Ligand binder design. Structure first.
Ligand SMILES: O=c1c(-c2ccc(O)c(O)c2)coc2cc(O)ccc12
Lengths: 114, 118, 118
């Protein structure tokens, strides 16, 4: 799994430990080993949500499987909770796009997962 | 809806008002309320289009519905027009990827937009 | 086609001519002409792979067609080889997401690549 967060929150507001917490909690939530979890945090972005530049986040989660109705609702509660707690971003100013990737469409280690 | 612009145009060339104009014109174009429109502009990028580092942009628009043949052509005319006018980027050096997102695959406000079944 | 590389490798470690080399290698690999290849490299990123902040890359390749099982395997060998050689990133710390785009879902030059129907 691969999680990306883009936010206008300043880099200094990103707490020590944040990447590791995302790695560990996403490993739990998706049921995949932590060694395969990739996380990417992009602070200080020029963005608006609803025409306002108050804190907001635009995110994505790509996973080979483990994507669906109930699972995505769970991921959103977990991730919005983390963004609210750690970056002080309001949940209703977060978007998360979920992608269920075909193993043939994911490259890794000179090949693909198919 | 969510619109992202990545460009090698410098931040100083992004005009006052640009995010708001994108927000409002996208609300108008998609028929979605302005409150739900998110915009993200990323200047000063290291990128090339056709091997040339002349001004270019790589963009995406994600929407739950309102994606399709004629609508996407209309979005492209609007967005290329804005990028040409405001950032001075040639329309033929712009790519825009359109994504029709399923409501169940979009997170917001502690949940998703699939609130009908559980 | 559009290739994006996001990495925690520093900007100064990105060799001059990297974007041009990616352009040429991708044109060759996809069969699409160089003029239509777009490349974007984003260094100095805050990211981890498997919990480690050693060099890694998260990438995407979008193409209208020319995406699939065998071809994606070939692309991965090519792109990982390039990232390993040029950016000194180990192949098992690289992810590449492949996207087969519909022509109607790619905007360019004030329209899309769906020019056949109205
Ligand atoms: O899902 C993944 C995995 C993955 C992690 C653990 C596994 O056991 C497995 O088969 C696949 C690895 O990298 C990815 C990169 C992506 O852009 C999307 C999904 C994944």
């Amino acid at each position: 799994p691969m999680f990306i967060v883009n936010t206008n929150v300043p880099r200094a507001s990103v707490p020590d430990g944040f990447l590791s917490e995302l790695t560990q909690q996403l490993a739990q939530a998706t049921g995949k080993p932590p060694q395969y979890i990739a996380v990417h945090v992009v602070p200080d972005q020029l963005m608006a949500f609803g025409g306002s530049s108050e804190p907001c986040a635009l995110c994505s989660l790509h996973s080979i499987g483990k994507i669906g109705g109930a699972q995505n609702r769970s991921y959103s509660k977990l991730l919005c909770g983390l963004l609210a707690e750690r970056l002080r971003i309001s949940p209703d100013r977060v978007y998360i796009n979920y992608y269920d990737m075909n193993a043939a469409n994911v490259g890794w280690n000179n090949s693909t997962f198919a």
